[PDB]
Design a protein around this ligand. Structure first.
Ligand SMILES: *[C@@H]1O[C@H](CO)[C@@H](O[C@@H]2O[C@H](CO)[C@@H](O[C@@H]3O[C@H](CO)[C@@H](O[C@H]4O[C@H](CO)[C@@H](O[C@H]5O[C@H](CO)[C@@H](O[C@H]6O[C@H](CO)[C@@H](O)[C@H](O)[C@@H]6O)[C@H](O)[C@@H]5O)[C@H](O)[C@@H]4O)[C@H](O)[C@@H]3O)[C@H](O)[C@H]2NC(C)=O)[C@H](O)[C@H]1NC(C)=O
Ligand SMILES: *[C@@H]1O[C@H](CO)[C@@H](O[C@@H]2O[C@H](CO)[C@@H](O[C@@H]3O[C@H](CO)[C@@H](O)[C@H](O)[C@@H]3O)[C@H](O)[C@H]2NC(C)=O)[C@H](O)[C@H]1NC(C)=O
Ligand SMILES: CC(=O)N[C@@H]1[C@@H](O)[C@@H](O)[C@@H](CO)O[C@@H]1O
Ligand SMILES: *[C@@H]1O[C@H](CO)[C@@H](O)[C@H](O)[C@H]1NC(C)=O
Ligand SMILES: [Fe+3]
Ligand SMILES: [Zn+2]
Ligand SMILES: [Zn+2]
Length: 340
């Protein structure tokens, strides 16, 4: 009853969810699907209760009647006076990142180059950059803009999946879950780091989290921030320290969604779960930490300080905001469970 079924996307999230389930005494239980879209369907059917989603997917889920419950809140400079759960959510910066050594590559010469994207339909990895490119181009032919890409979730035989690598064994190429090597913020930044693509569309935090010894992962151990540049919309290149003046847009934080008839119960349980496994929780370091997964951002982003209450009980449109909703609608003109 007072029990919540979480939806995990792919086998690595399933394994983390199982740990959470065991440690929560079954107050939380786990359903698994191969894609975020299938998880959303499980939630609509009432077979799962909730999962945490990028804004691009909140748009999808929202049209189907799901609602934002709590949002990821990361640590912050300003607003210091308030407690994390009650503090405003600032948003993250979507950026386009390249290697400094790839000189003369700018926003204006991106045509025909190779790209790395978090997943189709996600905010920084897809909706923002492709929305911008469609506008500037006057063509819905976004699948012919880059020569090759890894954009998990697109046709595996198309050039949008040509750079994706699949898992250990080459299986699951381009699936939009963490089995795909280049999936997600981390995967797309790795796609750039290994020089598979020329540009990665990720968020500001990703670059900092995987450079200068922050990550210890073999592929990122030796990465230095100075070897990277951000592409600015004015045709200029800047160091990654200048993200506030060189981003594509500001994105709404990832958030937990659920069926509206279950929102109150999901909120209640999660607030308690984070008191136990959260950043300064009774058991976090010692037994289980909800917001850690070795840089893999499983279930939640690793840089999450807490899940925060929303305030103004926003609808999904209010939560995403007018600027972003219009961007998506316009991009969606280019290309149930089709709820609206
Ligand atoms: C773009 O995104 C970046 C990445 O998030 C934003 O940078 C963060 O901004 C916030 C607020 O502006 C900074 O606030 C700090 O929060 C820190 C915790 O992350 C606190 O700093 C302590 O702990 C850090 C993490 O453990 C640690 O990292 C930083 O410092 C050293 C050297 O400078 C390096 O890493 C060390 O820590 C790791 C932990 O695993 C460890 O493995 C290493 O051996 C080091 O010990 C790293 O390079 C980084 O610079 C600090 O050492 C420090 O001990 C601090 O209390 C403060 O509240 C936050 O630190 C920034 N994050 C990082 C990682 O740099 C940036 O603001 C965004 N830009 C825009 C425009 O939005
Ligand atoms: C790609 O271009 C399209 C087409 O212009 C962009 O959509 C347009 O964006 C602006 C800014 O959000 C919208 O104007 C705003 O709308 C409200 C009411 O219309 C107004 O009060 C605001 O102050 C502002 O003027 C505009 O409506 C919208 N146009 C259409 C036809 O929907 C889109 O945002 C661009 N994509 C990206 C990623 O930049
Ligand atoms: C004041 C207020 O409600 N601000 C909200 C903020 O909390 C966050 O939900 C954001 C989502 O992108 O939308 C608004 O800015
Ligand atoms: C399980 O849920 C009940 C009801 O809130 C609570 O008393 C208990 O603390 C929960 N246990 C854990 C470990 O989450
Ligand atoms: Fe995102
Ligand atoms: Zn801006
Ligand atoms: Zn409202």
């Amino acid at each position: 009853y007072t029990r919540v079924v979480w939806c995990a996307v792919g086998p690595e999230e399933q394994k983390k969810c199982q740990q959470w389930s065991q440690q929560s005494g079954q107050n939380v239980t786990c359903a698994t699907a191969s894609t975020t879209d299938d998880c959303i369907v499980l939630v609509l059917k009432g077979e799962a209760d909730a999962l945490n989603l990028d804004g691009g997917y909140i748009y999808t889920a929202g049209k189907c009647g799901l609602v934002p419950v709590l949002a990821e809140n990361r640590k912050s400079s300003k607003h210091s006076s308030l407690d994390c759960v009650l503090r405003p959510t600032e948003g993250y910066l979507a950026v386009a990142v390249v290697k400094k050594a790839n000189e003369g590559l700018t926003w204006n010469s991106l045509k025909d180059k190779k790209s790395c994207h978090t997943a189709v339909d996600r905010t920084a990895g897809w909706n923002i950059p492709m929305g911008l490119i469609v506008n500037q181009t006057g063509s819905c032919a976004f699948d012919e803009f880059f020569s090759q890409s890894c954009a998990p979730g697109a046709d595996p035989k198309s050039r949008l999946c040509a750079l994706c690598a699949g898992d250990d064994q080459g299986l699951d190429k381009c699936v939009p879950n963490s089995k795909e090597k280049y999936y997600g913020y981390t995967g797309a930044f790795r796609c750039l780091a290994e020089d598979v693509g020329d540009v990665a569309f990720v968020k500001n935090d990703t670059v900092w989290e995987n450079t200068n010894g922050e990550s210890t992962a073999d592929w990122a151990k030796n990465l230095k921030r100075e070897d990277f540049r951000l592409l600015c919309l004015d045709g200029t290149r800047k160091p990654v320290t200048e993200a506030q003046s060189c981003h594509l847009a500001v994105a709404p934080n990832h958030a937990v969604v659920s069926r509206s008839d279950r929102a109150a119960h999901v909120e209640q349980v999660l607030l308690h779960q984070q008191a136990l496994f959260g950043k300064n929780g009774k058991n976090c370091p010692d037994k289980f930490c909800l917001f850690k997964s070795e840089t893999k951002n499983l279930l939640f982003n690793d840089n999450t300080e807490c899940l925060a209450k929303l305030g103004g009980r926003p609808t999904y449109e209010e939560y995403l905001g007018t600027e972003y909703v219009t961007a998506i609608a316009n991009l969606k003109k280019c290309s149930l469970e089709a709820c609206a």
